[PDB]
Amino acid sequence: ERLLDELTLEGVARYMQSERCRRVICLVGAGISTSAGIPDFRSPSTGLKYHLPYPEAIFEISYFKKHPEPFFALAKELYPGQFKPTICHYFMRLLKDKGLLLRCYTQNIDTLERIAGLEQEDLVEAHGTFYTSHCVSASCRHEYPLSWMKEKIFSEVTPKCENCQSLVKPDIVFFGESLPARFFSCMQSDFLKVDLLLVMGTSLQVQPFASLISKAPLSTPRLLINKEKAGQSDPFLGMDFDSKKAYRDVAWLGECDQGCLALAELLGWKKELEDLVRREHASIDAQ
C-alpha cells in the first residue's frame, strides 16, 4: 500500500493535487543552475597554477585560511555574467505561490533561489551563499552585500573590512567546515511535516546534505528530477526506484528544466509557469 497510485510523474502529479499532499520539501543542487549558465563548481573545468597541493584545496577551509587569494582569483574567473534563474527555480516559486512549499534546501551558493522569489524563511542554504559576506574578525562581523563583494573580486584586491581591515569572506561553507546550525534545526522540524520530497539537480554525493533523503517519513514519496539516477544504496557498502519492493520513489531522467516543465504541465500550471518565467527573464534582461 502506498500514497502514489503509480510510480510515475503522472502519479506524483495526481498525488500533489490530492488532499493528502500539503507540504513539499525541495532538495536542489548544481543541476538546477547549469542551464542558467552556471556550471557546477565541482566540475573539472574550473580546475585550470597557484602552487595548490591538490585540486580540492581551492575549496577546502584549511587552505583558504592564511591562503585566500587563489579562491578570490577563481571567484573572478567563474563569476557569472548574469544572474537569471531557471525554469526550475521559478517552479519552486510557483510551489510557494500555491501554498505547497514547506522548504527548499539548496546546495547552491549562486543566490538564484532568492532572485526567483524564495524568501529567507523558505530557504535553507546548506552550503551558505554569496548573497551576504562577513568580516572574519570575531569582534566585528560587519556584513556586506554581493554588490560590494563583486566589486572587490573584480578589482583583484582581497576584500578587506572597512571598519577593521580584516578579510571579508562570502557566507559560503567550505569543504571541511560545519554546516550552519540552521540546517540541522530546520531539518529536525521540517521532516516531521513533509508530504513530498522533490529532489532536483543533485547527485547526492556531498555530505551531510545527501543524507537528507533518509530523513523523510517512510510513506513520503520522493521524486528525483535529474540527468542521471542518484541516491540509490551503494552495493559496495536509499532510493528504490526499480525493484519489486519499490513503492514511493520516482526518477524522471533529463534536464531539470524539462522535468519541471513536464510536471507543471500535468498540474495544469504550464501557462502560469511560462508567463512567470518570461516576465522575470524579461525583467532581468532589462536591468
Partner: peptide, 5 residues
Amino acid sequence: PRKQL
C-alpha cells in the same frame, strides 16, 4: 558533520 566529498 563537516561538509565532505
